[PDB]
Amino acid sequence: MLIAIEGVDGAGKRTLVEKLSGAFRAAGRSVATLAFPRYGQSVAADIAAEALHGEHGDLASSVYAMATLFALDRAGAVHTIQGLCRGYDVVILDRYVASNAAYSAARLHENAAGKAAAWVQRIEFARLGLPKPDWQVLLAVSAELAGERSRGRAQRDPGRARDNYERDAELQQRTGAVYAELAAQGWGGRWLVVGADVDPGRLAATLA
Amino acid sequence: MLIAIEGVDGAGKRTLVEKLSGAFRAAGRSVATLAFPRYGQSVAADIAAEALHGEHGDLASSVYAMATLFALDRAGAVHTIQGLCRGYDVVILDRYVASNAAYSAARLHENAAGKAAAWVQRIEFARLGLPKPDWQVLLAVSAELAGERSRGRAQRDPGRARDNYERDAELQQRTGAVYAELAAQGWGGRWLVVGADVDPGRLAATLA
Ligand SMILES: Cc1cn([C@H]2C[C@H](O)[C@@H](COP(=O)(O)OP(=O)(O)OP(=O)(O)O)O2)c(=O)[nH]c1=O
Ligand SMILES: Cc1cn([C@H]2C[C@H](O)[C@@H](COP(=O)(O)OP(=O)(O)OP(=O)(O)O)O2)c(=O)[nH]c1=O
Ligand SMILES: [Mg+2]
Ligand SMILES: [Mg+2]
């Protein structure tokens, strides 16, 4: 089974991935996790991050350029993903294709039924062959709280300064809204919307 | 030996590659040729071409986004290139790294000593590890004549309509000028500037 954890920056995704992995293992299931962007393993991913931190000229100013880099990263992970699926009972992805749809639409002030989301659907799932997730878990949190967590991380970790997307409060707000729409329409597969207080044990039961 | 043939659109590069390959073979040397962008073999290359023909939203509007796609294409060809070099006496590339430097600088109205060219140098040669060519042959031609050949191709071949760069006469002119500067400073390696009347036999002798 393939599960993707989605949400805005600072929503608490990384933590849910760890608590969820623990719950699945407590249930006797083998688990593997993979996070996107794959920093260090994908040139496209590294350039994307660097662009969001001020490098590479006008690259970051293009919504489709950034989306393409993230899609190229995932395109290079197809074999890895399929490999994990046949090797473990559960594979949890920290961000996946929906991240591209949500942020791209938000940067363009479009909704889930818009152009960017449709483009991501055509390119990543159909064209690049990325498998559709069995479940997509949206960790919905207030934009304010998520932003506070992003700011806090940067304050105590010099290696985690915020990037262009994280510093854009309005973008973060719009991204959360598109995410909610995507989940409501079951974009790319079945979704589950949870809060910060979700119980990892019951969540793993629903997913398993 | 690794040779790259450079020049603006419609300069006659593809033809020189064939005549040059023939000259080398007439001299008893084994030859292999590879053309960039690698359409069909690189997703990055295909998306780039599609963007120049009107697709993928605002992607083509970013100078660095386009340069990155072409660099990612070449990054995926490193093994192929090194393989050809150890398998054949001569490897001829139809366009290579300098194409990115020339067009990127021209789109930004910069010269060869500018930011974009320096960026291409840092990313493709040093960072991505693309080997520097032993020779870079600039097929210099008048912007007007080259443009006429581009228009002619589109007229007799529905599968070869011109793209955003080809329809930009001023860009083509500026690109030719940056190419001349690159050759003058030996950017990326030794250059040789030839005209449309160059003799393939003597050119192959100079290169071999
Ligand atoms: C994977 C993916 C991410 N993104 C966005 C979400 C974020 O705003 C931004 C960065 O990806 P993040 O996964 O947030 O990574 P990061 O670079 O912020 O790293 P860290 O967690 O160590 O601080 O890119 C997309 O727009 N599309 C995608 O397909
Ligand atoms: C390889 C490469 C090409 N280019 C530019 C040169 C051209 O204007 C454009 C297209 O590449 P071309 O090699 O011209 O290919 P094409 O798509 O025009 O195909 P055809 O010859 O079949 O008609 O991209 C770069 O800017 N950087 C690069 O690194
Ligand atoms: Mg982030
Ligand atoms: Mg062309």
Instruction: Calculate the alpha carbon distances from A129 to A44, A114, A126, B43 in Å.
Output: 18, 21, 5, 12
From the CA of B97, give the closest atom in ligand 2: 29
Q: Which domains does chain A have, with CATH numbers?
A: 1-208 (3.40.50.300)
Nearest CA-CA distance, residue A43 and chain B, Å? 8
Counting ligands in written order, the one closest to the CA of A63 is 1
- CB atoms closer than 10 angstroms to residue B180: 15
Closest chain B residue to the Cα of A127, Cα to Cα: B43
Which method, experimentally, gave rise to this model?
X-ray
Q: State the alpha helices, DSSP H only, in A60-142.
A: 63-75, 78-87, 97-107, 115-120
DSSP secondary-structure letter at A159?
G
Q: Which residue, A61, A146, A150, is CA-closest to A108?
A: A61
Query: In this structure, which residue's CA is closest to atom 14 in ligand 2?
Result: B9
Any idea how long chain B is? 208
Question: What is the layout of strands, in order, in the sheet containing A135-139?
Answer: A31-35, A90-94, A2-6, A135-139, A190-194
Instruction: Note whether A72 contacts B119, CB cutoff 8 Å.
Output: no
Resolution in A: 1.9
Q: How far is A118 from chain B (nearest CA, A)?
A: 11
Scan for tokens 């970013």, then name that residue: B62
* 3-class DSSP state of A3: strand
The two three-digit tokens of residue B49, written as one number: 């071409």
CB A4 within 8 A of CB A85: no
A199 token code pair: 């119980």
